[PDB]
Each structure stands twice: as structure tokens, then as C-alpha cells.
Amino acid sequence: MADTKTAPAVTLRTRKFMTNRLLSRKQFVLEVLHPGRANVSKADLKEKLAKLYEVKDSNCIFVFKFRTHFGGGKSTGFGLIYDNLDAAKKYEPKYRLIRNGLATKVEKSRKQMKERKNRAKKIRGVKKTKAGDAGKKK
């Protein structure tokens, strides 16, 4: 598996694989042995990997949901290889996309967003004249 240095391989293993022609992609489990070593990395995975299944891009493919167990030397996550960049986005939830680089996470303020819609309903006419009206009126 998994290319070596001196610091051991950290196995690149796949398992429980179905190619599903609805989602139009490859779903599988990545069970990464890490004998005597820490974390494989999100990069190191999608840099090997790529060239086995011959998707040959890191960009479209995502790996996630590492959790683990006690005792060390293994970690379990899940990763997918997608048939196209365009196709992938539609099927994928947004949380995958944002970290992958395909999307930006927009931050919002609750108070600003909801109140503003109500204001638009209330004014009818240009209503510029009302500002001048109030000045005169006191």
C-alpha cells in the first residue's frame, strides 16, 4: 500500500465499496492503519489514492468523518471519488464542499437578515418624502 519513507507506510486501504449509478459515484470506507505513527493527513490520502482509481485529481474528491477508537494504530473515516466536478456538487452536502475548496461558507447575522425583510413590506411608495415630512412635522 501507501508509499514509505523511513517513517512507516501508514496503509492506504479501501473497503465496503459500492458504485451506485444514482448518486453516480464511488462510495467506500478508508480504514487507515497508522502503525507507530500519527495522522495520515487530508492531503497525503488524496495524493496517493487518486492514481489508483485514476480520477487523478485531489480537487474533486473528499475524505472525512475520522473519529477513531482507543489503542491507536488505526483510524476509520470515509471517502468518495466522484465521476465529474459538476456532478459531484449537486449530490454532495455543503459541508464537504466548503472544506474541499469548492465552496465558501457564508456567515450571517440572524437579527440583520430577518428584520430587513419586514421593513421592505412596510414601505409603499418612494417614501423619501416621509423623511422630509417628519423634519417639518417635528
Binding site: 465496503k16 459500492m18 451506485n20 449509478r21 444514482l22 448518486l23 462510495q27 467506500f28 470506507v29 472525512f64 468523518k65 470515509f78 449537486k90 449530490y91 454532495e92 452536502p93 464537504r96
Partner: protein, 200 residues
């Protein structure tokens, strides 16, 4: 219901809520027609089959009696076995022959009763055959603990107020009797479809 059934195929990880994209691109069809409704009523013997590069499925029962996929032939997918759930009877030849999913099919066979079953195709809704409910026929029990068992009808008992029980000889164990609503006949001497081990 559709959402559960689709998810059974998908379940490796992280789909589920994203079922919606599949549905709206019409890469799921149920009985050759578009439905995107999770709340859709389903029963035994629904056919699922999706466009072009697809597969064909028959709804079957697990140990609980919940819907699960089995692969079925493309030839069999063209046909469907439908319980006549309720009936509008007789004159001038205008039956509404209700089914579990809610399909209507119209106009006399030289028979027609409640609890009898009608063999239908899929798309056009024309009558392939009509299957009489009678003794010696093969049955699936749709509900209760006993679900996922098949057996042959020993006798039907008829009484006042309702016909209370219909008895089935066979079972993994021994004989049991059920209500008419629980009984869905799935095979007859005239036409069976039954060549399946089942459930529990």
C-alpha cells in the same frame, strides 16, 4: 414509503437528506412514474425501476415486516400484482378498483370482489389477469408478528357481521389464521408469481 426504501440501497454513508437531488433529477422512478413524495403510500409488490441504466426491484419483507429491496427481472417489472383494496360495485360497468398505493383501474372482469386480487401491468393500467380469492391459493400475511411467511389456504370461515378469520395451513411452525385485510393472495393455481423463500 419511498424515502426509507431508497435509503436502504444508498446506505454506506452520507446521503439521506441528499436523496432530494436524485428525486428532482428524476433518476428515481417508481412504477415507471415520477413521485418525489416521501409520504407516498406503499405496500407489498411495488415495483421500483429507474431510467435507462437501471435495475428492477420488488418490495419484500424482512423479519419485522418492513419493506426491503430484492432484485427482480425486467420481464417481471412490466407486471405488478395489486390487491383490490376496495371496490365500487357493478352496474353500467364503472368499478373504482382501489389498490394499496391508490391506483384506480376501471371496468368489469367476469367476476370482481373485495379481497380478490387483480393482475395489472405497470404503465398503462390494463388488466393482464384477474385472480380469484379461494381455497388452495398462496398467501402472504402483511402484518403482525407472522409477516414474511407464506402458506396455502386451508379454509375460509364466514360468519355474521364480518367474515372473521381465514385459515392458512402452512407456516414455519404450524397453522395460523388471520383477518381478510391481513391476507393478500399472491398466487393461485391459474397464475402464481411465487418462487421465493421469505422473511423469517
Amino acid at each position: 414509503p419511498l424515502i426509507l426504501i431508497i435509503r436502504n440501497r444508498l446506505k454506506y454513508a452520507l446521503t439521506y437528506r441528499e436523496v432530494i437531488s436524485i428525486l428532482m433529477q428524476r433518476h428515481v422512478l417508481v412504477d415507471g412514474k415520477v413521485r418525489t413524495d416521501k409520504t407516498y403510500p406503499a405496500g407489498f409488490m411495488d415495483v421500483i425501476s429507474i431510467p435507462k441504466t437501471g435495475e428492477n426491484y420488488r418490495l419484500l419483507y424482512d423479519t419485522k415486516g418492513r419493506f426491503r429491496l430484492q432484485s427482480v427481472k425486467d420481464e417481471d417489472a412490466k407486471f405488478k400484482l395489486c390487491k383490490v383494496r376496495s371496490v365500487q360495485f357493478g352496474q353500467k360497468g364503472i368499478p373504482y378498483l382501489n389498490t394499496y398505493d391508490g391506483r384506480t383501474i376501471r371496468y368489469p372482469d367476469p367476476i370482481i370482489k373485495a379481497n380478490d386480487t387483480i393482475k395489472i401491468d405497470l404503465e398503462t393500467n390494463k388488466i393482464v389477469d384477474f385472480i380469484k380469492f379461494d381455497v388452495g391459493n398462496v398467501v402472504m400475511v402483511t402484518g403482525g408478528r407472522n409477516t414474511g411467511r407464506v402458506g396455502v389456504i386451508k379454509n375460509r370461515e364466514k360468519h355474521k357481521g364480518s367474515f372473521e378469520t381465514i385459515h392458512v395451513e402452512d407456516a414455519l411452525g404450524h397453522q395460523f389464521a388471520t383477518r381478510l385485510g391481513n391476507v393478500f393472495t399472491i398466487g393461485k393455481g391459474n397464475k402464481p408469481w411465487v418462487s421465493l423463500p421469505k422473511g423469517k
